[PDB]
C-alpha cells in the first residue's frame, strides 16, 4: 500500500535563526508527494524479514521519516544500528512513559519485542545490556489525551538523522480526525536533541509490546498486533528547498526544487510568486556514452615469438646481445602463458608492461643451471653472478626462466654449455667478455703455470633431462628496456577498440583526448591527415589511424532549459523550452527519466513543437497568430485566452499545458494611394501618458580597507603594500556620488527661484487636485506624488544595510526641498508661461497658456476657446484616469524598482563574495589569522585579499557603467525638462506619442515622472481637395489652409482639423496662372 507524503518531513535545518526570511538550503529531506509504505500489521504471511512480527526491520538509508498514529498510547521505542544484536553496535531508544532513556547497548537478538508474556512480562526487549556505551535520560516523548480528550487522533512525526556522528531527532504532536490517511496542511519539525554517536546505521525496527488485544479468542493469547496501530515510512533524499520564515521566526511554508520545473523556478527566483516570464534556469548539456574507440585493423609487431620460441639459445657467458625496436610490442603472452618457469620484474610492473614505452629493447638469452637461477637479479653474488652475466642495481626489465630438460637436455648427455668458475674480468655489469682465459701471466703464484698448470676456468656443464635441480637447465631471456635515452620507440599492443556512430562518445584517436559525436564526413585528407581544424585547437575533423576513413566530430550536442510560467497567482502550469536541441533527442540527457516522476521532467509528452531555438516540451502550437507575450525565440510567443475552444483552458494557453503561436504584430490598417481626397480630423482626443526615468542611484561609499580588512592590522599592512588601488576605488565612488548630486541639481534646479503655488487655485476649469503638493497635509507631497512615493515598493525588498566598510551618505537635496523645486516648476509652468526659464518669469492666464501651446502644433485659439469647456473637461477626466493606472497596474514603475534592485543585487552579492574563501582554507578572517603561524597565514590571507580586491574591482567598474548610462538618462531627463516644461518641443515622439502639448514634473524616490499630454487625433473623414483654383485665367494657392470640396462646393480648411472656409483672397496666395499641375478645379473665388 502506497500513500503520498503530501507536505510532511520539513524541519528547521540548523539552530540558526531568521525572521521573515525566504532562506534556502539543501539538506537530506523527504521529497514532496512521495509514495510511503503503509505498514499496518502482520497481515498473515505479510512478514518477509521477521517472523510473527507485524512490520519487519527495514534498511536505514541515511534517513527516514517516521510517524505513528493511535487512539491511545501504544507504540514503544525503536532499535537502530547495523545488526541490532550483541555482535555489532546498535542503538535503542525506548519510551518508558515515565521518561526516555537512550542507549547504544548491544542487546541479544530478540526476534520480536513481544515474545509470547503479553504484558505481565518485564521488558522482554532488554535481552542483554552488555557493552552499554551510552545512556541518557529525559522527559518522555509522549502522546495521548490529544487522541481522546479531543477525541481526535494524535500524531508524532519523527526524523532520525545520522549526520556526522550527530543523531538529530525531531518531533511534533497534533490531533487528527481524518484518520484514514496523512492529511494536507503544513507543519514543521523542531529537534529535541543531538547525539554524538558515530555509529553506522543501516537497519532499524519499531518496537511495540502486546499488552492484551482481543484479536484472537484465547482470553490470554488474544494479545495480537494484526489490526493494531500502524505507521508510515519514507526516505530522505538530498534535495534543496526554499523555506518561508515567519515574523515570530517559524517555518510557515516550504517549496521543492526538483519536484516541478515550477518549483525549480521558484527556487531560482527566490520567492513564492513568480510573474509571467521565461526564466533561464539550469542547463543540462549531456552525459557522454562509454569510452575510447579506435578500430580493429593495421598494427605492427616485434618478433618476440621469433626469439622466445627459438629453441636454441647460447652460452650464459657468451650471452646473446639482441636489440629490438621500431614495432608494436605485446607482453601479455609471455607474462601470462605458462611457458616460463619464472617471471620476476625489477622496477617495471608486468601489468603495465604494454602501456609503457621504451626507446630500445635488448634481449640477452641463454641457458642456466637450475640452482644458479637465483643469481640473475640486482644484488646477486656467485660464479655466474660475477663472471658470466651480472645484473647491476638499476632498472632491468625482468628475469624470466623456463626449464628445457626436454629441449636443452638430451639423454645422451649434454655438456655443451659451460659455467666459468671464478676467473674472468669481474664483469662491470653488461660486459660480453668471451675471451679464452687460459693463462693470466703464466708465472703468478695464484694461477700462473706454477702451482696450477692444468686449469681452465670455463667448466663445461653436463646435464641430462632427469638429473635433478642444479643439473636442471632453465632457459633465460632478459628484456633490457633502454628508455628515456632518446625518443621512445617500443610500446605494447594498442589500437584496441571499435568505433561508434552518432552518439555522444568520449573518444581518443591516437592521443586526441576529446568528447563528441562521430559522423561520416566527406572531404579528403592528404597524408597530412591525422586530424583537421577550424580555429586554434578546434579539432573538428579526424580520421581513423588504422583503416583510413575520415569523420566529423561535432560537440556534446546539446542541453537546455528555459522554463515558461504564466504566473503563480493566476495559474500553476509549466512548460519547458530547450535551447537549440532537436528534441528527437528527447531533450534532457536523452529522456532523463532518472528524476522525479513528472511528465514535463519525464519529457515524452505528445505535446511538442520544434522551432529555431529547440522545442517546447509542453507545446500546443497553433496557426492563428495573436499578439506576442512571454517571448520564446525567433518570433514565436505564448499566452492566449481561457476559452479558445474548450472551457477547461486558462489564460495560460491550454491549461496544464502551453501553446506557442508565431508572433503577429497585429492586423493591417492600410489606406491606398488617394487621388487627392484627404482623410482629415473632424473630432479628436487630447490625452495623456506617462514616462519614468531614473535620474540617480542611491549614494554609496566603501572604505576599501574596512571592507577588505575590517580591523586586522596585518591585512592593512598588506593592503598598503598593494599600492594605491584603494585610493582609486574610493575616489571613483566619490566621483559617482558627487555626480549623482550634480544630476539631481541639473534635473530639478533649472529655474532660478520658486514661484509659490497660488493660494486660490481656480485654474480655468483645469482642476489639478492631484499635482500641486498637499494643501497642508504632511510633507507637502502631492496626491499623485504621494502615491508615487508610496506605490513604489516601500519595502524596496528592504535595503534598510550597512555592516562593515559599507555606508550611505545621504543626498544633498532632500525630498521636501526636491518637491518644493518640483512645485515651483509646476507654478511657473502654469501661471508664468514658457518663460520661467528664459529670464525673469512673466505671467499669463492658463487659457492662453494652452491656446498658444495648441499654436505649437498648428491650431489657432479659436479651436480651444470654442471648445475650452469640453477640451478642459477631457483634460480633467484623462488626468484623473492617470491616477487610476498609476495606482493600479502592478509593475507599472518597473524602471525605478529595477534600478534600486540592481544596486541591491550589487551590494548583496558583494557581501556574499565577502563570504567566500577564494582558495583560502577558510572565508572568515580572524581564525585563519589566528590558526596558523606567520608565513602560511600571510600567504593564505593574501590570497583572500587578492580575491576580495578583484571582487570589489568588478563592483566598482559595474557601478561606473551603470552610473554613466544613468548619466545619459539624466541628461535626457533634464533635456526633456527643458524642452517641454520650459517650452514645448517638436522633436517627434520625444514629448509624448503625438503632437505635444505640455509636460509635468513629478518627484520620485530616485527618478522622475513626466505626464506627456499629447494630441492624438480621431474620426477621420474623406473630402475632395485641389492644390489650386484657376480663376480669371489664374491659379490660386492657399496661405492659411487648403481648399476642400464637399463634392459640389469648395472649402478652406487646415491640416490637422477639419475647419473649412469660403474661398477668399486674403487667405489665398496668387502667382503666375494655372501652371503645369495636377488636381486643379473650377468654382472660383469671391
Amino acid at each position, epitope marked *: 500500500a502506497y500513500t503520498n507524503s503530501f507536505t510532511r518531513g520539513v524541519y528547521y535545518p540548523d539552530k540558526v535563526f531568521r525572521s521573515s526570511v525566504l532562506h534556502s538550503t539543501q539538506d537530506l529531506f523527504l521529497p514532496f508527494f512521495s509514495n510511503v509504505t503503509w505498514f499496518h500489521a502482520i497481515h498473515v504471511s505479510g512478514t518477509n524479514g521477521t517472523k510473527r512480527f507485524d512490520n519487519p526491520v527495514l534498511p536505514f538509508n541515511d534517513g527516514v521519516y517516521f510517524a505513528s498514529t493511535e487512539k491511545s498510547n501504544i507504540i514503544r521505542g525503536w532499535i537502530f544500528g547495523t545488526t541490532l544484536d550483541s555482535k555489532t553496535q546498535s542503538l535503542l531508544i525506548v519510551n518508558n512513559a515515565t521518561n526516555v532513556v537512550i542507549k547504544v547497548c548491544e542487546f541479544q537478538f530478540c526476534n520480536d519485542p513481544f515474545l509470547g508474556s503479553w504484558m505481565e512480562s518485564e521488558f522482554r526487549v532488554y535481552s542483554s545490556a552488555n557493552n552499554c556505551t551510552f545512556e541518557y535520560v529525559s522527559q518522555p516523548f509522549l502522546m495521548d489525551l490529544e487522541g481522546k480528550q479531543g477525541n481526535f487522533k494524535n500524531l508524532r512525526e519523527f526524523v532520525f538523522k545520522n549526520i556526522d556522528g550527530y543523531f538529530k531527532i525531531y518531533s511534533k504532536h497534533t490531533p487528527i480526525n481524518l484518520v484514514r490517511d496523512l492529511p494536507q496542511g503544513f507543519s514543521a519539525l523542531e529537534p529535541l536533541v543531538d547525539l554524538p554517536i558515530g555509529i553506522n546505521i543501516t537497519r532499524f525496527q519499531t518496537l511495540l509490546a502486546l499488552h492484551r488485544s482481543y484479536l484472537t479468542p484465547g482470553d490470554s493469547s488474544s494479545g495480537w498486533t494484526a489490526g493494531a496501530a500502524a505507521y508510515y515510512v519514507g526516505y530522505l533524499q538530498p534535495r534543496t528547498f526554499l523555506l518561508k520564515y515567519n515574523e515570530n521566526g517559524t517555518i510557515t511554508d516550504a517549496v521543492d526544487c526538483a519536484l516541478d520545473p515550477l518549483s525549480e523556478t521558484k527556487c531560482t527566483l527566490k520567492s513564492f510568486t513568480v510573474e509571467k516570464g521565461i526564466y533561464q534556469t539550469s542547463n543540462f548539456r549531456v552525459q557522454p556514452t562509454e569510452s575510447i574507440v579506435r578500430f580493429p585493423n593495421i598494427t605492427n609487431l616485434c618478433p618476440f615469438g621469433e626469439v622466445f620460441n627459438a629453441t636454441r639459445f647460447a652460452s650464459v657467458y*657468451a650471452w646473446n646481445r639482441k636489440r629490438i625496436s621500431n614495432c608494436v610490442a605485446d607482453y601479455s603472452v609471455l607474462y601470462n602463458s605458462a611457458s616460463f618457469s619464472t617471471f620476476k620484474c625489477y622496477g617495471v610492473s608486468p601489468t603495465k608492461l604494454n602501456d609503457l614505452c621504451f626507446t630500445n629493447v635488448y634481449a640477452d638469452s641463454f641457458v642456466i643451471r637450475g640452482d644458479e637461477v637465483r643469481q640473475i637479479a640486482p644484488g646477486q653474488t656467485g660464479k655466474i653472478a660475477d663472471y658470466n652475466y651480472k645484473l647491476p642495481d638499476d632498472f632491468t626489465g625482468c628475469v624470466i626462466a623456463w626449464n628445457s630438460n626436454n629441449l636443452d637436455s638430451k639423454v645422451g*648427455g649434454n*655438456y655443451n*654449455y659451460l659455467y666459468r668458475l671464478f676467473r674472468k674480468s669481474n664483469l662491470k655489469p653488461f660486459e660480453r667478455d*668471451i675471451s*679464452t682465459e*687460459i693463462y693470466q701471466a703464466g708465472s703468478t703464484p695464484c694461477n700462473g703455470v706454477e702451482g696450477f698448470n692444468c686449469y*681452465f676456468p670455463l667448466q*663445461s656443464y*653436463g646435464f641430462q633431462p632427469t638429473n635433478g635441480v642444479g643439473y636442471q637447465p632453465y632457459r633465460v631471456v632478459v628484456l633490457s628496456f633502454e628508455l628515456l635515452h632518446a625518443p621512445a620507440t617500443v610500446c605494447g599492443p594498442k589500437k584496441s577498440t571499435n568505433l561508434v556512430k552518432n552518439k555522444c562518445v568520449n573518444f581518443n584517436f591516437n592521443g586526441l583526448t576529446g568528447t563528441g559525436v562521430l559522423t561520416e564526413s566527406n572531404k579528403k585528407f592528404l597524408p597530412f591527415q591525422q586530424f583537421g581544424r577550424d580555429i586554434a585547437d578546434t579539432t573538428d575533423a579526424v580520421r581513423d589511424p588504422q583503416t583510413l576513413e575520415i569523420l566529423d566530430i561535432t560537440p556534446c550536442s546539446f542541453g537546455g532549459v528555459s522554463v515558461i510560467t504564466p504566473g503563480t497567482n493566476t495559474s500553476n502550469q509549466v512548460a519547458v523550452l530547450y535551447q537549440d536541441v532537436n528534441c528527437t533527442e528527447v531533450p534532457v540527457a536523452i529522456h532523463a527519466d532518472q528524476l522525479t516522476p513528472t511528465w514535463r521532467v519525464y519529457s515524452t509528452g505528445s505535446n511538442v513543437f520544434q522551432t529555431r531555438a529547440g522545442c517546447l516540451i509542453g507545446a500546443e502550437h497553433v496557426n492563428n497568430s495573436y499578439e506576442c507575450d512571454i517571448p520564446i525565440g525567433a518570433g514565436i510567443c505564448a499566452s492566449y485566452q481561457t476559452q479558445t475552444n474548450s472551457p477547461r483552458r486558462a489564460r495560460s494557453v491550454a491549461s496544464q499545458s502551453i501553446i506557442a503561436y508565431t508572433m503577429s504584430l497585429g492586423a493591417e490598417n492600410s489606406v491606398a494611394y488617394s487621388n487627392n481626397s484627404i482623410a482629415i480630423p473632424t473630432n479628436f482626443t487630447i490625452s495623456v501618458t506617462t514616462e519614468i526615468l531614473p535620474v540617480s542611484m542611491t549614494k554609496t561609499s566603501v572604505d576599501c580597507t574596512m571592507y577588505i580588512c575590517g580591523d586586522s592590522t596585518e591585512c592593512s599592512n598588506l593592503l598598503l603594500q598593494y599600492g594605491s588601488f584603494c585610493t582609486q576605488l574610493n575616489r571613483a565612488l566619490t566621483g559617482i556620488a558627487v555626480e549623482q548630486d550634480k544630476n539631481t541639481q541639473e534635473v530639478f534646479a533649472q529655474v532660478k527661484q520658486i514661484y509659490k503655488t497660488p493660494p486660490i487655485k481656480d485654474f480655468g476649469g483645469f482642476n489639478f487636485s492631484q499635482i500641486l503638493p498637499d494643501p497642508s497635509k504632511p510633507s507637502k507631497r502631492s496626491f499623485i506624488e504621494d502615491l508615487l512615493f508610496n506605490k513604489v515598493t516601500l519595502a524596496d525588498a528592504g535595503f534598510i544595510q550597512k555592516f562593515n566598510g559599507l555606508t550611505v551618505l545621504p543626498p544633498l537635496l532632500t525630498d521636501e526641498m526636491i518637491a518644493q523645486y518640483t512645485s515651483a516648476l509646476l507654478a511657473g509652468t502654469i501661471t508664468s508661461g514658457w518663460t520661467f526659464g528664459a529670464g525673469a518669469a512673466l505671467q499669463i492666464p492658463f487659457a492662453m497658456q494652452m491656446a498658444y501651446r495648441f499654436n505649437g502644433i498648428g491650431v489657432t485659439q479659436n479651436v480651444l476657446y470654442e471648445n475650452q469647456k469640453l477640451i478642459a473637461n477631457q483634460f480633467n477626466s484623462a488626468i484623473g484616469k492617470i491616477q487610476d493606472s498609476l495606482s493600479s497596474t502592478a509593475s507599472a514603475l518597473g524602471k525605478l524598482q529595477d534600478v534600486v534592485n540592481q544596486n541591491a543585487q550589487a551590494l548583496n552579492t558583494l557581501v556574499k563574495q565577502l563570504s567566500s574563501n577564494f582558495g583560502a582554507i577558510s572565508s572568515v578572517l580572524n581564525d585563519i589569522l589566528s590558526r596558523l603561524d606567520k608565513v602560511e597565514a600571510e600567504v593564505q590571507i593574501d590570497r583572500l585579499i587578492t580575491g576580495r580586491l578583484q571582487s570589489l574591482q568588478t563592483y566598482v567598474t559595474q557601478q561606473l557603467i551603470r552610473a554613466a548610462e544613468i548619466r545619459a538618462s539624466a541628461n535626457l531627463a533634464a533635456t526633456k525638462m527643458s524642452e517641454c516644461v520650459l517650452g514645448q518641443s517638436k522633436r517627434v515622439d520625444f514629448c509624448g506619442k503625438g503632437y505635444h502639448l505640455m509636460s509635468f514634473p513629478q518627484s520620485a524616490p530616485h527618478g522622475v515622472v513626466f505626464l506627456h499630454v499629447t494630441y492624438v487625433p480621431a474620426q477621420e473623414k474623406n473630402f475632395t481637395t485641389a492644390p489650386a483654383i484657376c480663376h480669371d485665367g489664374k491659379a490660386h494657392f492657399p496661405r492659411e489652409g487648403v481648399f476642400v470640396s464637399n463634392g459640389t462646393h469648395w472649402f478652406v480648411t487646415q491640416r490637422n482639423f477639419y475647419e473649412p472656409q469660403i474661398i477668399t483672397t486674403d487667405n489665398t496666395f496668387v502667382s503666375g496662372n494655372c501652371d503645369v499641375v495636377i488636381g486643379i478645379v473650377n468654382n472660383t473665388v469671391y
Partner: nanobody
Framework: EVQLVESGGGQVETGGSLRLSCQAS????????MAWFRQRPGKEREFVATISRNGGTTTYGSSVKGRFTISRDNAKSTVYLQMNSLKPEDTAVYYC?????????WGQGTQVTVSS
C-alpha cells in the same frame, strides 16, 4: 653465415699427421675463434688444444701441447690443424667450434679415427 662444416678429419694411424679444417658458409673468419675437442667412444668430449682470435696466439691445452699444430687462415676461409706425435686415444669426432657469435658452434662434425 656461420654454417660451420668441419673438414680435414679422417682415418689416421697412431703417430701420423693430417690437416683438419672447417668453413663457415662464406663469411669472416678472423673474429670467430675455433676450438677443438676429443670425444673417445665409451666416454664423452674432452679438450686438447685451441686457438685465440689472433691465430698467432697458439693457446693449446694444458696436456702435452706440442702434439698439434693450429692456424686460422683468413685468406683461405679454413682453419688448419696438423696433429703430430699421435696416440691411439684420440679416435674422436671433432668440431671446429668457431666461438664468436654462436658459442656451441658446429654442424658437420669431423671424424678422426686413430688406427693401430
Amino acid at each position: 653465415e656461420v654454417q660451420l662444416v668441419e673438414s680435414g678429419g679422417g682415418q689416421v694411424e697412431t703417430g701420423g699427421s693430417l690437416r683438419l679444417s672447417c668453413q663457415a658458409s662464406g663469411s669472416t673468419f678472423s673474429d670467430y675463434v675455433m676450438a677443438w675437442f676429443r670425444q673417445r667412444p665409451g666416454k664423452e668430449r674432452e679438450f686438447v688444444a685451441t686457438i685465440s682470435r689472433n691465430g698467432g696466439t697458439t693457446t693449446y691445452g694444458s696436456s702435452v701441447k706440442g702434439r698439434f699444430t693450429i692456424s686460422r687462415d683468413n685468406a683461405k676461409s679454413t682453419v688448419y690443424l696438423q696433429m703430430n706425435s699421435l696416440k691411439p686415444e684420440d679416435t674422436a669426432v671433432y668440431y671446429c667450434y668457431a666461438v664468436g657469435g654462436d658459442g656451441d658452434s658446429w654442424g658437420q662434425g669431423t671424424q678422426v679415427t686413430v688406427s693401430s
